[PDB]
Amino acid sequence: SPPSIHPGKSDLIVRVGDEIRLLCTDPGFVKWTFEILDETNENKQNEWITEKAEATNTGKYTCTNKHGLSNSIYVFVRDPAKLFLVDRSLYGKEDNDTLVRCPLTDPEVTNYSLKGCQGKPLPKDLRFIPDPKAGIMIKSVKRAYHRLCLHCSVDQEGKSVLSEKFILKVRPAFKAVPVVSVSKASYLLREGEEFTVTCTIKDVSSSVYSTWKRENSQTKLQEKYNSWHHGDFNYERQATLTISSARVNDSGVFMCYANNTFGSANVTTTLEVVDKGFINIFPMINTTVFVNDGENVDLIVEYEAFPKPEHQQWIYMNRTFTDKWEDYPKSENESNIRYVSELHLTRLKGTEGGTYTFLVSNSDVNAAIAFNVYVNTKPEILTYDRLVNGMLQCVAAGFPEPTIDWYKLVVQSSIDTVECKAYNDVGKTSAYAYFNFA
Amino acid sequence: SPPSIHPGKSDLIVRVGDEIRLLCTDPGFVKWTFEILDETNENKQNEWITEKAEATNTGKYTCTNKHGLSNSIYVFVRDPAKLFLVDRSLYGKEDNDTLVRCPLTDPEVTNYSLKGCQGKPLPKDLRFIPDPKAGIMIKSVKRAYHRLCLHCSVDQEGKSVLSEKFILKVRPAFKAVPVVSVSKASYLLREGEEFTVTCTIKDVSSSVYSTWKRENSQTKLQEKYNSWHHGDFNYERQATLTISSARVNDSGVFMCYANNTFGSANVTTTLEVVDKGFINIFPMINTTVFVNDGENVDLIVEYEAFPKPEHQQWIYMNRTFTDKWEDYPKSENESNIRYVSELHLTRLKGTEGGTYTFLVSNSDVNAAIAFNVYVNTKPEILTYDRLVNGMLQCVAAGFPEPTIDWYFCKLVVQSSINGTVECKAYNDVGKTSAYAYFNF
Amino acid sequence: ICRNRVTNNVKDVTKLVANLPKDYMITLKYVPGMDVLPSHCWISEMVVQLSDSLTDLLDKFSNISEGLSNYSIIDKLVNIVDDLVECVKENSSPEPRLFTPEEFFRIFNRSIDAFKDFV
Amino acid sequence: ICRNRVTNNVKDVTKLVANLPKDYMITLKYVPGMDVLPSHCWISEMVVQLSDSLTDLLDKFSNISEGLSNYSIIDKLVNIVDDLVECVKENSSKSPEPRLFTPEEFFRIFNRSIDAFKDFV
Ligand SMILES: *[C@@H]1O[C@H](CO)[C@@H](O[C@@H]2O[C@H](CO)[C@@H](O)[C@H](O)[C@H]2NC(C)=O)[C@H](O)[C@H]1NC(C)=O
Ligand SMILES: *[C@@H]1O[C@H](CO)[C@@H](O[C@@H]2O[C@H](CO)[C@@H](O)[C@H](O)[C@H]2NC(C)=O)[C@H](O)[C@H]1NC(C)=O
Ligand SMILES: *[C@@H]1O[C@H](CO)[C@@H](O[C@@H]2O[C@H](CO)[C@@H](O)[C@H](O)[C@H]2NC(C)=O)[C@H](O)[C@H]1NC(C)=O
Ligand SMILES: *[C@@H]1O[C@H](CO)[C@@H](O[C@@H]2O[C@H](CO)[C@@H](O)[C@H](O)[C@H]2NC(C)=O)[C@H](O)[C@H]1NC(C)=O
Ligand SMILES: *[C@@H]1O[C@H](CO)[C@@H](O)[C@H](O)[C@H]1NC(C)=O
Ligand SMILES: *[C@@H]1O[C@H](CO)[C@@H](O)[C@H](O)[C@H]1NC(C)=O
């Protein structure tokens, strides 16, 4: 059967500077043990006696035996000088009760309660349970109480008294996943360039955990970190991968991953590493082109070029152009390797049919595509002449070849008001002779 | 004569809490005067006594008669604690001497000298003259010494002792004129608009005078100010002039004038206030132009426009013309209200002659100029016939109208007269021919 | 007169009073009853005393080049009140008392508000 | 371990030390012999006492909107130390008498305490 103590009473009140005497009656007695706040004492004698109590002698005193059966006393050293013992580190986790460590030295007091700093009120929904032996306990600490500051308040002789400040820190409980973003959705690098992507993780706490993984590889990558606190419950981390010198087999998907007690987010970037640069060219129209006299035409290439192309030029019959061609990337997005080149030719003259070439270069490669352009023309009539034999001949010059009727490629037609008229798919032109006979 | 004074010394030395007792006799005697630093006391008795001298009693004593004449004795109260009296104010006009008011209270001390604070050595060239009665004096204060810190230094019983700590203030000599600049040298405004211009003035000191005045008008204008110090000897003022409702006779030359004890500097800005907007247009080429078919030509206009020209369009035969015309302000200057519009017709076809018009506007005005483009074209021969009359017909159409010549052995011209007979039709661009044969 | 001497770096005093600790104590020979008396009576002495206290404050801080340090603000306030000493002496002790920043800068802004009204 | 919990708002400390008055005194329940001792025994107590001192020091300043301010810098340092306490109480998981320091000395002690978390157990 457990120990028994003299004084018997569960609660004892002693004046400051009074003597304290407790005796525990146990053939199996082992120790007195005394606790308040964090402080501990343990004493070997079956008597615990103290000649002059100080306020910090307030607390709980427990007698225990070789069975481990125990019996307890709590002692209040009433000292008018300070009513509270305080232990002032007041951390609390969100959604959890949180104790404010202001146990009393005199239990014979009224209205023991919790109250704000500088006469500011407490948040309206904050509620608490008081306890002289332990302190005053704040239920269900919310984020709105972060850095809330608090006094412990007690009414004595009809007059109200305050402890030293307490400032309530709040460890947030996670209620959403970390939020993750990456500087570039995908990369393309010439072999030997330096891959460097930077994740960004945002959460309420710096105990969010984040890593970079080469997909289908478990191994750890090297990385460098920077992080900031942007006010309360707002943390941001930036984690930067680098492959110091890209090799071809580094092509793959990297994943940036972030999890907290609530859940997980990942965000991924994909790297292509190309052993040497390239250009590929596609004409948006047949390379052979036909135009009529005075007609209008465009020449159009689309090409994919990495690295970004450095010289773009258009040449006609080995003589270069300017002021007639437009160059633009095909899409806006920052992953763009594809480009469009157009040349515009206006009301083309008959002589300007020929060959037109487009030349593009980057460091690695130089590539050409060539276009063949035929200016059709109305037949035009060169000679109408009557020869010594009495014959008369018409000549027409055209593309496509003229056909000749009587009423560039070059055609001549011969005969023994006459008219010569020369037609092809573009038009007609005609030349005149008039004859009288006697 | 001046008063005699007892004791007959020049200087007189006393231990602290001793008695100071000075006996003056002129039959005309009027008053003592006692001076140290700022502090003064004046006593009408022909005898001056204090039973227990404090260190502060250190100072000069002058006894003055009704005849106007004065005789003086100077007193020290030697005291181990207060070795220096001090007044911590220390200001120097640059390039003048300045004084460090740390007069001694026991003169029989060695190497009365000046020292930097925190150990630091004084500037290489700072040189000074000590005097136990007045202090220490710093020859030719210069700007490098601004907020130099100082201690006055005494050696007494072989030990080295320092005053309370002093900071030298330097007050510039003005050695260059102000520097003045204005946010825009020229303004143009519709009447009733706000007018606002800002002048910046920079100098070593905020005592630079600066004003806004209207030339050929002496009265000074209404102004709002902003200034900053930008570190030592670097001040900047900004002064802003506003008229909330401009008007034509509010035009003129406005001047920002700034001067200082060295000399002035100014910068003007000119304001034009116009009663209503305008557009004025100049054709860079004759309004009638002649082009051989299949050549390019340019139509070009330049124009002044205020407020800025909102709409610009080029139209051909009652229909707009697009993607072949370019326009730019003529000059990059902010003053430039002048603009260029050019239209690049290309390889003009013979059918595209006629009027081309350019239309430009702002709020105030809508303005037009028109160009006539004639496209010359090599003649062509239409018909070759003979009439019922026994007469021959050759017919050719060209701009300019063709001209027809005969040999024997767009606008239209129809022309007439063992043989071969030829007509030739030609203009300034083109030559063409057609033939008839007559056999007899 | 002397209004144009006081540049508008004084508008930074509120940012300075924000950065000085509430607890800190600044020391100023305070001309008694200046809170009551007309401007011309105290102002001459006060501007000398303020120039001194502000240079003492200037010793306490150091020159953070990025941003507005307290050193920069107090420096430019020393530039002001020294020029006010210069004009007051050109154109026209107490016992040391201890002020928190809000109180000392109250006295500062009251003194400077005297120059918009000066003779 | 707990190297992640110390965000890099600490570089601001050099500026905070430059804006605090040289003769301003700050109060810390300094663990005696923190200088000579190994990290592990003093570091547990010191992050608690630094959290306390930095929170009191935080009360002393107002909060400017524009620019950096002592209240901003200290508030972020307080976030750090309140996380280092949260981990130490949770990974080791097994008062001194107040002393008064000029800001440079207090921040010396702070920076040494944070340099303790670059190899902790
Ligand atoms: C949150 O992230 C970490 C990393 O995966 C997880 O911790 C690992 O969990 C697995 C399985 O429980 C263990 O085998 C590993 O030893 C842990 N590794 C590390 C470095 O701690 C944690 O469990 C994650 N899970 C969730 C649901 O958030
Ligand atoms: C990485 O993120 C993606 C989503 O961004 C996750 O893909 C989902 O995974 C769940 C099962 O875990 C599936 O039910 C969904 O259909 C998936 N959505 C998509 C778009 O695929 C993925 O599981 C995450 N992987 C890791 C290791 O976190
Ligand atoms: C520098 O700035 C002002 C503007 O003129 C000058 O002050 C004026 O000086 C004349 C002659 O002494 C007086 O009549 C005016 O009354 C003064 N005006 C003001 C507002 O004080 C000063 O003299 C200037 N110029 C020179 C050469 O010193
Ligand atoms: C305002 O500014 C100009 C110079 O910036 C003043 O000085 C005159 O300028 C011209 C051309 O630079 C010089 O040839 C003259 O020698 C200058 N005048 C004199 C007397 O030397 C101009 O005089 C100034 N006006 C005022 C009222 O200050
Ligand atoms: C990539 O290439 C290097 C050299 O060939 C090789 O050592 C390495 O194992 C490769 N890494 C992967 C993930 O394939
Ligand atoms: C002409 O100028 C003077 C001064 O600028 C001004 O008072 C007057 O009103 C102006 N005249 C009219 C009709 O506004």
Coordinates of N, CA and C in Angstrom, one line a residue, chain B residues 215-370:
Chain B
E215 N 11.6 87.6 -68.2 CA 12.4 88.6 -68.9 C 11.6 89.7 -69.5
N216 N 12.1 91.0 -69.4 CA 11.3 92.2 -69.6 C 10.1 92.3 -68.7
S217 N 10.3 91.7 -67.5 CA 9.3 91.9 -66.4 C 10.0 91.7 -65.1
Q218 N 10.2 92.8 -64.3 CA 11.0 92.7 -63.1 C 10.5 91.9 -62.0
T219 N 9.1 91.9 -61.7 CA 8.5 91.2 -60.6 C 8.8 89.7 -60.7
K220 N 9.2 89.1 -59.5 CA 9.5 87.7 -59.4 C 8.2 86.8 -59.3
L221 N 8.3 85.6 -59.9 CA 7.1 84.7 -60.0 C 6.9 83.9 -58.8
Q222 N 5.7 83.3 -58.7 CA 5.3 82.4 -57.7 C 5.9 81.0 -57.9
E223 N 6.4 80.4 -56.8 CA 7.3 79.3 -56.9 C 7.1 78.3 -55.7
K224 N 7.3 77.0 -56.0 CA 7.3 76.0 -55.0 C 8.6 75.2 -55.1
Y225 N 9.1 74.8 -53.9 CA 10.5 74.4 -53.8 C 10.6 73.0 -53.2
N226 N 11.7 72.3 -53.6 CA 12.2 71.1 -53.0 C 13.7 71.2 -53.0
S227 N 14.3 70.8 -51.9 CA 15.7 70.7 -51.9 C 16.2 69.5 -51.2
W228 N 17.5 69.1 -51.3 CA 18.1 68.1 -50.6 C 19.6 68.4 -50.4
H229 N 20.1 68.2 -49.2 CA 21.5 67.9 -49.0 C 21.8 66.5 -49.5
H230 N 22.9 66.3 -50.1 CA 23.4 65.0 -50.7 C 24.7 64.6 -50.2
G231 N 25.0 64.8 -49.0 CA 26.3 64.7 -48.4 C 27.0 66.1 -48.3
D232 N 28.2 66.0 -47.7 CA 28.9 67.3 -47.4 C 29.1 68.1 -48.6
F233 N 28.9 69.4 -48.4 CA 29.1 70.4 -49.5 C 28.5 70.0 -50.8
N234 N 27.3 69.5 -50.8 CA 26.6 69.1 -52.0 C 25.1 69.3 -51.7
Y235 N 24.5 70.4 -52.2 CA 23.2 70.8 -52.0 C 22.5 70.9 -53.4
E236 N 21.2 70.5 -53.4 CA 20.5 70.6 -54.7 C 19.1 71.2 -54.3
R237 N 18.7 72.2 -55.1 CA 17.4 72.8 -55.0 C 16.7 72.6 -56.3
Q238 N 15.4 72.4 -56.2 CA 14.5 72.3 -57.4 C 13.4 73.3 -57.2
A239 N 13.1 74.2 -58.1 CA 12.2 75.3 -58.0 C 11.3 75.2 -59.2
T240 N 10.0 75.3 -59.0 CA 9.0 74.9 -59.9 C 8.0 76.1 -60.1
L241 N 7.7 76.3 -61.4 CA 7.0 77.5 -61.8 C 5.8 77.0 -62.6
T242 N 4.6 77.5 -62.2 CA 3.4 77.0 -62.7 C 2.5 78.1 -63.1
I243 N 1.8 78.0 -64.2 CA 0.6 78.8 -64.5 C -0.5 77.9 -64.8
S244 N -1.6 78.0 -64.1 CA -2.6 77.0 -64.2 C -3.5 77.1 -65.4
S245 N -3.6 78.3 -65.9 CA -4.4 78.6 -67.1 C -3.5 79.5 -68.0
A246 N -2.7 78.9 -68.9 CA -1.9 79.7 -69.8 C -2.8 80.6 -70.7
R247 N -2.2 81.5 -71.4 CA -2.9 82.4 -72.3 C -1.8 82.9 -73.3
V248 N -2.3 83.6 -74.4 CA -1.3 84.0 -75.4 C -0.2 84.9 -74.8
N249 N -0.7 86.0 -74.1 CA 0.3 86.9 -73.6 C 1.0 86.4 -72.4
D250 N 0.8 85.1 -71.9 CA 1.7 84.5 -71.0 C 2.9 83.8 -71.7
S251 N 3.0 84.0 -73.0 CA 4.2 83.6 -73.7 C 5.4 84.5 -73.3
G252 N 6.6 84.0 -73.6 CA 7.8 84.8 -73.3 C 9.0 84.0 -73.0
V253 N 10.0 84.7 -72.5 CA 11.2 84.1 -71.9 C 11.1 84.0 -70.4
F254 N 11.1 82.8 -69.8 CA 11.2 82.6 -68.4 C 12.7 82.3 -68.1
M255 N 13.2 82.8 -67.0 CA 14.5 82.7 -66.6 C 14.6 82.1 -65.2
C256 N 15.5 81.1 -65.0 CA 15.8 80.6 -63.6 C 17.2 81.2 -63.3
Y257 N 17.2 82.2 -62.4 CA 18.4 82.9 -62.0 C 18.9 82.4 -60.7
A258 N 20.2 82.1 -60.6 CA 20.8 81.6 -59.3 C 22.1 82.3 -59.1
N259 N 22.4 82.8 -57.9 CA 23.7 83.4 -57.6 C 24.0 83.1 -56.2
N260 N 25.3 83.5 -55.9 CA 25.9 83.2 -54.6 C 27.0 84.2 -54.5
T261 N 27.7 84.2 -53.3 CA 28.6 85.4 -53.1 C 29.8 85.4 -54.0
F262 N 30.0 84.4 -54.9 CA 31.0 84.4 -56.0 C 30.4 85.0 -57.2
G263 N 29.3 84.5 -57.8 CA 28.7 85.0 -59.0 C 27.6 84.2 -59.5
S264 N 26.8 84.9 -60.4 CA 25.5 84.3 -60.8 C 25.7 83.3 -61.9
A265 N 24.6 82.6 -62.2 CA 24.4 81.7 -63.3 C 22.9 81.7 -63.6
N266 N 22.5 81.6 -64.9 CA 21.1 81.5 -65.2 C 20.9 80.6 -66.4
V267 N 19.6 80.2 -66.5 CA 19.1 79.4 -67.7 C 17.7 79.8 -68.0
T268 N 17.4 80.1 -69.2 CA 16.1 80.5 -69.6 C 15.4 79.3 -70.3
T269 N 14.0 79.4 -70.4 CA 13.2 78.6 -71.1 C 12.1 79.4 -71.8
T270 N 11.8 79.1 -73.0 CA 10.9 80.0 -73.8 C 9.6 79.3 -74.0
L271 N 8.5 80.0 -73.8 CA 7.1 79.5 -73.9 C 6.4 80.2 -75.0
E272 N 5.8 79.4 -75.9 CA 4.9 79.8 -76.9 C 3.5 79.3 -76.5
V273 N 2.5 80.2 -76.4 CA 1.1 79.8 -76.1 C 0.3 80.2 -77.4
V274 N -0.3 79.3 -78.0 CA -1.0 79.5 -79.3 C -2.5 79.5 -79.1
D275 N -3.2 80.3 -79.8 CA -4.6 80.5 -79.6 C -5.5 79.3 -80.0
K276 N -5.0 78.6 -81.0 CA -5.6 77.3 -81.5 C -4.6 76.5 -82.2
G277 N -4.8 75.2 -82.3 CA -3.9 74.3 -82.9 C -3.7 74.7 -84.4
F278 N -2.8 74.0 -85.1 CA -2.5 74.2 -86.5 C -2.0 72.9 -87.1
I279 N -2.1 72.8 -88.4 CA -1.3 71.9 -89.2 C -0.8 72.8 -90.5
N280 N 0.4 72.7 -90.8 CA 1.0 73.3 -92.0 C 1.7 72.2 -92.7
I281 N 1.6 72.2 -94.1 CA 2.1 71.1 -94.9 C 2.9 71.6 -96.0
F282 N 4.0 70.9 -96.3 CA 4.9 71.3 -97.4 C 5.2 70.0 -98.2
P283 N 4.9 70.1 -99.5 CA 5.2 69.0 -100.4 C 6.7 69.1 -100.8
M284 N 7.4 68.0 -100.6 CA 8.9 68.0 -100.9 C 9.2 67.9 -102.4
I285 N 8.1 67.7 -103.2 CA 8.3 67.6 -104.7 C 7.1 68.3 -105.3
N286 N 7.1 68.6 -106.6 CA 6.0 69.2 -107.2 C 4.7 68.3 -107.0
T287 N 3.6 69.0 -106.9 CA 2.4 68.2 -106.7 C 1.9 67.4 -107.9
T288 N 2.7 67.5 -109.0 CA 2.5 66.7 -110.2 C 3.8 66.0 -110.6
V289 N 3.7 64.7 -110.7 CA 4.9 63.9 -110.9 C 4.7 62.9 -112.0
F290 N 5.7 62.6 -112.8 CA 5.6 61.8 -114.1 C 6.6 60.6 -114.0
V291 N 6.0 59.4 -114.2 CA 6.7 58.2 -113.9 C 6.6 57.3 -115.2
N292 N 7.7 56.8 -115.7 CA 7.6 55.8 -116.7 C 7.1 54.5 -116.1
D293 N 6.1 53.8 -116.8 CA 5.5 52.6 -116.3 C 6.5 51.6 -115.9
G294 N 6.3 50.9 -114.7 CA 7.2 50.0 -114.2 C 8.5 50.7 -113.7
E295 N 8.3 51.7 -112.9 CA 9.3 52.3 -112.0 C 8.7 52.7 -110.7
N296 N 9.5 52.7 -109.6 CA 9.0 53.3 -108.4 C 9.1 54.8 -108.3
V297 N 8.2 55.4 -107.5 CA 8.2 56.8 -107.2 C 7.9 57.0 -105.7
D298 N 8.3 58.1 -105.1 CA 7.9 58.4 -103.8 C 7.1 59.8 -103.7
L299 N 6.0 59.8 -103.0 CA 5.3 61.0 -102.6 C 5.7 61.3 -101.2
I300 N 6.1 62.6 -101.0 CA 6.6 62.9 -99.6 C 6.1 64.3 -99.2
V301 N 5.6 64.4 -98.0 CA 5.1 65.6 -97.4 C 5.8 65.8 -96.1
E302 N 6.0 67.0 -95.7 CA 6.5 67.3 -94.3 C 5.6 68.4 -93.8
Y303 N 5.3 68.3 -92.5 CA 4.3 69.2 -91.9 C 4.5 69.5 -90.5
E304 N 4.1 70.7 -90.1 CA 4.1 71.1 -88.7 C 2.7 70.8 -88.1
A305 N 2.7 70.3 -86.9 CA 1.4 69.9 -86.4 C 1.4 70.1 -84.8
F306 N 0.4 70.8 -84.3 CA 0.3 71.0 -82.9 C -1.2 71.3 -82.6
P307 N -1.8 70.5 -81.7 CA -1.3 69.4 -80.9 C -0.9 68.2 -81.9
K308 N -0.3 67.2 -81.3 CA 0.3 66.2 -82.1 C -0.7 65.5 -83.1
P309 N -0.3 65.1 -84.3 CA -1.2 64.7 -85.3 C -1.7 63.3 -85.1
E310 N -3.0 63.2 -84.9 CA -3.7 62.0 -84.4 C -4.0 61.0 -85.5
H311 N -4.4 61.4 -86.7 CA -4.7 60.6 -87.8 C -3.9 60.9 -89.0
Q312 N -3.3 59.9 -89.6 CA -2.6 60.1 -90.9 C -3.0 59.0 -91.8
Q313 N -3.4 59.4 -93.1 CA -3.8 58.4 -94.0 C -3.5 58.9 -95.4
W314 N -3.3 57.9 -96.3 CA -3.0 58.2 -97.7 C -4.1 57.5 -98.6
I315 N -4.7 58.2 -99.5 CA -5.8 57.7 -100.2 C -5.6 57.8 -101.7
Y316 N -6.0 56.8 -102.5 CA -5.9 56.8 -103.9 C -7.3 56.6 -104.6
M317 N -7.7 57.5 -105.4 CA -9.0 57.4 -106.1 C -10.1 57.0 -105.2
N318 N -10.4 57.8 -104.1 CA -11.4 57.6 -103.1 C -11.3 56.2 -102.4
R319 N -10.0 55.8 -102.1 CA -9.8 54.6 -101.4 C -8.5 54.6 -100.7
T320 N -8.4 54.2 -99.4 CA -7.2 54.2 -98.7 C -6.1 53.3 -99.2
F321 N -4.9 53.6 -98.9 CA -3.7 52.9 -99.4 C -2.8 52.6 -98.1
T322 N -2.4 51.3 -98.0 CA -1.9 50.8 -96.8 C -0.7 49.9 -97.0
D323 N 0.1 49.7 -95.9 CA 1.3 48.8 -95.9 C 2.4 49.2 -96.9
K324 N 2.4 50.4 -97.5 CA 3.5 50.9 -98.3 C 3.9 52.3 -98.0
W325 N 3.5 52.9 -96.9 CA 3.8 54.2 -96.5 C 4.4 54.3 -95.0
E326 N 5.3 55.2 -94.8 CA 6.1 55.3 -93.6 C 6.0 56.7 -93.1
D327 N 6.0 56.9 -91.8 CA 6.0 58.2 -91.2 C 6.8 58.3 -89.9
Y328 N 7.5 59.4 -89.7 CA 8.3 59.6 -88.5 C 8.4 61.1 -88.2
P329 N 8.5 61.5 -87.0 CA 8.9 62.9 -86.7 C 10.2 63.2 -87.4
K330 N 10.3 64.4 -87.9 CA 11.4 64.8 -88.7 C 12.7 64.8 -87.9
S331 N 12.8 65.4 -86.7 CA 13.9 65.5 -85.9 C 13.6 64.8 -84.5
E332 N 14.7 64.3 -83.9 CA 14.6 63.6 -82.6 C 14.4 64.6 -81.5
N333 N 14.7 65.9 -81.7 CA 14.6 66.9 -80.7 C 13.2 67.0 -80.1
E334 N 13.1 67.3 -78.8 CA 11.8 67.5 -78.1 C 11.1 68.8 -78.6
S335 N 11.9 69.8 -79.1 CA 11.3 71.0 -79.7 C 10.6 70.7 -81.0
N336 N 11.1 69.8 -81.8 CA 10.5 69.5 -83.1 C 9.0 69.2 -83.0
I337 N 8.2 70.0 -83.7 CA 6.8 69.8 -83.9 C 6.5 69.3 -85.4
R338 N 7.5 68.7 -86.0 CA 7.6 68.6 -87.5 C 7.8 67.2 -87.8
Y339 N 7.1 66.8 -88.9 CA 6.8 65.4 -89.2 C 6.9 65.1 -90.7
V340 N 7.3 63.9 -91.0 CA 7.5 63.5 -92.4 C 6.6 62.3 -92.6
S341 N 5.9 62.3 -93.8 CA 5.1 61.2 -94.3 C 5.5 60.9 -95.7
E342 N 5.8 59.7 -96.0 CA 6.3 59.3 -97.3 C 5.5 58.1 -97.7
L343 N 5.2 58.0 -99.0 CA 4.4 56.9 -99.6 C 5.3 56.3 -100.7
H344 N 5.5 55.0 -100.7 CA 6.4 54.4 -101.7 C 5.5 53.6 -102.6
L345 N 5.0 54.3 -103.7 CA 4.5 53.5 -104.8 C 5.7 52.8 -105.5
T346 N 5.4 51.6 -106.0 CA 6.4 50.7 -106.5 C 5.9 50.2 -107.9
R347 N 6.9 50.2 -108.9 CA 6.7 49.6 -110.2 C 5.3 50.0 -110.8
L348 N 5.0 51.3 -110.8 CA 3.6 51.7 -111.1 C 3.2 51.2 -112.4
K349 N 1.9 50.7 -112.4 CA 1.3 50.3 -113.7 C 0.7 51.4 -114.4
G350 N 0.6 51.3 -115.7 CA 0.1 52.4 -116.5 C -1.3 52.8 -116.2
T351 N -2.1 52.0 -115.5 CA -3.5 52.3 -115.1 C -3.6 53.0 -113.8
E352 N -2.5 53.1 -113.1 CA -2.6 53.7 -111.7 C -2.2 55.2 -111.6
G353 N -2.2 55.9 -112.8 CA -2.1 57.3 -112.7 C -3.3 58.0 -112.1
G354 N -3.2 59.3 -111.8 CA -4.2 60.1 -111.2 C -3.8 60.5 -109.8
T355 N -4.8 61.0 -109.1 CA -4.6 61.7 -107.8 C -4.3 60.7 -106.6
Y356 N -3.4 61.2 -105.8 CA -3.0 60.6 -104.5 C -3.0 61.7 -103.5
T357 N -3.7 61.4 -102.4 CA -4.0 62.5 -101.4 C -3.6 62.0 -100.0
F358 N -3.2 63.0 -99.2 CA -2.7 62.7 -97.9 C -3.5 63.6 -96.9
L359 N -4.0 62.9 -95.9 CA -4.9 63.6 -95.0 C -4.4 63.4 -93.6
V360 N -4.4 64.5 -92.8 CA -3.8 64.5 -91.5 C -4.7 65.4 -90.6
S361 N -4.8 65.1 -89.4 CA -5.6 65.9 -88.5 C -5.1 65.8 -87.0
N362 N -5.6 66.8 -86.3 CA -5.6 66.8 -84.8 C -7.0 67.3 -84.3
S363 N -7.1 67.6 -83.0 CA -8.3 68.2 -82.5 C -8.7 69.5 -83.3
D364 N -7.7 70.4 -83.4 CA -8.0 71.7 -83.9 C -8.3 71.7 -85.4
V365 N -7.6 71.0 -86.3 CA -7.7 71.1 -87.7 C -7.5 69.8 -88.4
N366 N -8.1 69.7 -89.6 CA -7.9 68.6 -90.6 C -7.4 69.2 -91.9
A367 N -6.3 68.7 -92.3 CA -5.5 69.2 -93.4 C -5.2 68.2 -94.5
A368 N -5.2 68.7 -95.7 CA -5.1 67.8 -96.9 C -4.1 68.4 -97.9
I369 N -3.3 67.5 -98.5 CA -2.6 67.9 -99.7 C -2.6 66.7 -100.7
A370 N -2.7 67.1 -102.0 CA -3.0 66.1 -103.0 C -1.9 66.1 -104.1

